Design a protein around this nucleic acid. Sequence first.
RNA 1: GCCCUGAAAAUGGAUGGCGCUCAAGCGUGUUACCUAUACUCUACCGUCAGGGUUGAUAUGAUGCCCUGACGAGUAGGCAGG
Length: 52
Amino acid sequence: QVWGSETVASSKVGYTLPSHIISTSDVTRIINSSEIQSAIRPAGQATQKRTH
RNA sequence: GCCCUGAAAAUGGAUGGCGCUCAAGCGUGUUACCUAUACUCUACCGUCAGGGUUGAUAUGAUGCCCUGACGAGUAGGCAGG
């Protein structure tokens, strides 16, 4: 009641709970899930071989 | 051309000094040699730029790795400690 929700507004005048700029806090889950992994080029080596 | 006269200033003194006379002087030529924080190569430090790298079961993604170039400095500005 004191801070409000999606049903009770805030119990404070003109106040709403803050919104998120990103829907999840796990960036690794987004990268690997289904769609980015099908649109990205194959990976490298994580360390380049010293040439010449 | 060289040398000499012309050419006299005050502490004792200045091709830098010693000294040098078919020079160790002058003009000119042939080479050899001496080595600067310059150049070339290599290592390391930092800076800048271009790239690679979030796959899960490990520790830093302002992280790690690759490659190239660069490095003077008062007044002054900025950054990291």
